Design a binder for this molecule. Structure first.
Ligand code: HEM
Ligand SMILES: [Zn+2]
Ligand SMILES: [Zn+2]
Ligand SMILES: [Zn+2]
Ligand SMILES: [Zn+2]
Ligand SMILES: [Zn+2]
Length: 454
């Protein structure tokens, strides 16, 4: 039995105050750098063990021994995401039922049907940037977020948020973002039921209602029209779980739609933003990727197969996910009393948290140049050990949206590289904001048109 290190405690709240910050995952990364591959983290009546090495994480990823846990963060998100795929326990009825129903709508094959509407939004992004005046700049995460949110709105339920036409976010977005903020902020309140938090809770309900109203109404409208628009909502309304013969109920469909909108807004937009960041900081790599984009994307309207041919753009995206996996942590629990790593006994139910950024900096796997941006790491997928690279989570609880995210990102980054040269005009200093996910706050660039019509 080896004793685990533990960071400083701060009274009855034990370790909690270390995460009472705007950048808690970055704090945990620093603790991991200080204490090593495993450390214990205490809160009142809770002990969590944070894992950073491939040696220990590969064992945590054994689904016969460990299952997905709902961290307190996910439990608060569950207040509006309900028993949607992302905030359900594996054993809960609606997890397997929605998983079976939805899996085919997220396959690589399904991406052929989403491709046109992904291109519709991508073209809007390119046209926006073509239309800026010489003295103007691009706010990168802002525009990536407009793109990824609008794309899931169109593929999820055939709705146009029209984010490239508006001053203030569509009112659903404003409410979803404020709800996610409250959910994370709740984690840091020592006395939740203190009167100063009353306007928070009133605002929380107003927001949740703005969400359910767009969504319950969108579901009832579709049920009433019978319109067979070929999208995720159609598939959820018509699909039946082969294991049980039952379809999802309207309440669960609402939760799935809210969940996809959260993911659309929070995740892929972060990846695109980090990718563009690393490219402007590594101009030779940018030129290599732009050369591939010019060679491959020879139609003003890119096709599905052309996106599949963007091999080096895919490597750039994987290397951006290596350094800054945008959904950087996931939680597991021991299915039974067991011993981790031959050294750390666990009780049934004990929580393990995987720090993906730390996993992805394990020098025993990646070599000494781990901190550097080198897409060529990914030239041979066979060279990457099992469980060394995990930006989409693990096993049956991995990201159902992986193919969707990578198709969208590869298409968009390819079109960006086809149509513009990029200038890091401010010499931007990386500043990572944490919501549900990681994104580069304040990242701005200038884009000079290559004058290729589309
Ligand atoms: C680059 C973009 C994305 C990344 C890095 C990412 C990452 C992840 C990770 C790490 C998990 C596992 C979470 C856990 O174990 O607690 C996950 C789950 C999930 N993601 Fe994503 N995601 C991305 C994009 C998307 C998109 C675009 C969608 C859908 C529109 C999506 C929908 C989901 C859902 C429903 C789950 C839960 C799957 C299940 O447990 O059945 N994600 N994602
Ligand atoms: Zn600005
Ligand atoms: Zn937003
Ligand atoms: Zn279909
Ligand atoms: Zn026991
Ligand atoms: Zn070096």
């Amino acid at each position: 039995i080896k004793e685990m290190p533990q960071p400083k405690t701060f009274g009855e709240l034990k370790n909690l105050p270390l995460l009472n910050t705007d950048k808690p995952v970055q704090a945990l990364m620093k603790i991991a750098d200080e204490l090593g591959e495993i450390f214990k983290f205490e809160a009142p009546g809770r002990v969590t063990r944070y894992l950073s090495s491939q040696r220990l994480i590969k064992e945590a990823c054994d689904e016969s021994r460990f299952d997905k846990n709902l961290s307190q963060a996910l439990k608060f998100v569950r207040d509006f995401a309900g028993d949607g795929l992302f905030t359900s326990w594996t054993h809960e009825k609606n997890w397997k039922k929605a998983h079976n129903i939805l899996l085919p709508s997220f396959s690589q094959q399904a991406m052929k049907g989403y491709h046109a509407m992904m291109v519709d939004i991508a073209v809007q992004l390119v046209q926006k940037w073509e239309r800026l005046n010489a003295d103007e700049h691009i706010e990168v995460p802002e525009d990536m977020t407009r793109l990824t949110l609008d794309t899931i709105g169109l593929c999820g339920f055939n709705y146009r948020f029209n984010s490239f036409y508006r001053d203030q976010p569509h009112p659903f977005i404003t409410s979803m973002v404020r709800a996610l903020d409250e959910a994370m902020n709740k984690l840091q309140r020592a006395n939740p039921d203190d009167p100063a938090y009353d306007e928070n809770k009133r605002q929380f309900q107003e927001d949740i209602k703005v969400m359910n109203d767009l969504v319950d109404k969108i579901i009832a409208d579709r049920k009433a029209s019978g319109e067979q628009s070929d999208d995720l909502l159609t598939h959820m309304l018509n699909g039946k779980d082969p294991e049980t013969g039952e379809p999802l109920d309207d309440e669960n469909i609402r939760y799935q739609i809210i969940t996809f909108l959260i993911a659309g807004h929070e995740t892929t937009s972060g990846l695109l933003s980090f990718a563009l960041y690393f490219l402007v900081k590594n101009p030779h790599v940018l030129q290599k990727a732009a050369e591939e984009a010019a060679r491959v994307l020879v139609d003003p309207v890119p096709s599905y197969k052309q996106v599949k041919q963007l091999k080096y753009v895919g490597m750039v995206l994987n290397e951006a996910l290596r350094l800054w996996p945008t959904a950087p942590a996931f939680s597991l629990y021991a299915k039974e009393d067991t011993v981790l790593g031959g050294e750390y006994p666990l009780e049934k139910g004990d929580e393990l948290m995987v720090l993906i950024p730390q996993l992805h900096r394990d020098k025993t796997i990646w070599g000494d140049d781990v901190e550097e941006f080198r897409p060529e790491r990914f030239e041979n997928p066979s060279a990457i050990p099992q469980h060394a690279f995990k930006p989409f989570g693990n096993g049956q609880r991995a990201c159902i949206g992986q193919q969707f995210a990578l198709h969208e990102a590869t298409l968009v980054l390819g079109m960006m590289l086809k149509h513009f040269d990029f200038e890091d005009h401010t010499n931007y200093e990386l500043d990572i904001k944490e919501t549900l996910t990681l994104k580069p706050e304040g990242f701005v660039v200038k884009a000079k048109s290559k004058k290729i019509p589309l």
